[PDB]
Each structure stands twice: as structure tokens, then as C-alpha cells.
Amino acid sequence: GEYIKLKVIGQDSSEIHFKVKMTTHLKKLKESYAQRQGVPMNSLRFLFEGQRIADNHTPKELGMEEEDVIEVYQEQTGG
């Protein structure tokens, strides 16, 4: 077990932090975040350094560290 805190930043500049393990499938984070915004998880896309976070990605796989940022955008097409 090894935990890290990630900062999730939404379209309106709000932030929610998540404490997760390096091995945590990031679907859990996506679901929780969408839940707290009251929108369906599949209306959102979650990006790390601009790349899409897959349900089965982990922080270790993406090379995330303590206090890294995840951005949340509306799912495309919309700009």
C-alpha cells in the first residue's frame, strides 16, 4: 500500500482532492467525482497532462505523483 493525493479541477475551477493508492483503478475516482457533481460519469472526460484517463488506468501506469492535477472537461464533441 502506497497512497497519493490528486487534485481534480473542473470546468468552473473548483477543486476536489482524492487520496488513492498507486494501484487504484481510476474509474473509482471518475465515478466519485461525477457523483459529487451530479452528472453521469460518461458526460465527462478526465485528462492527465491532456491525455484521457481510462477506467483501468492507475496512477502508477500514468506516472502520477503526490499533488498532480487531473482536469475534467465535458465529453466531446463540445468545445
Binding site: 477543486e15 476536489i16 482532492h17 482524492f18 487520496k19 488513492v20 493508492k21 487504484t24 475516482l29 466519485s32
Partner: peptide, 11 residues
Amino acid sequence: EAEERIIVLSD
């Protein structure tokens, strides 16, 4: 300013 929000994800 929003308060700090930390959610711990179990495993």
C-alpha cells in the same frame, strides 16, 4: 473560497 475537500478512495 470553497473549503478543502478530500475524498479517500478505499480499495
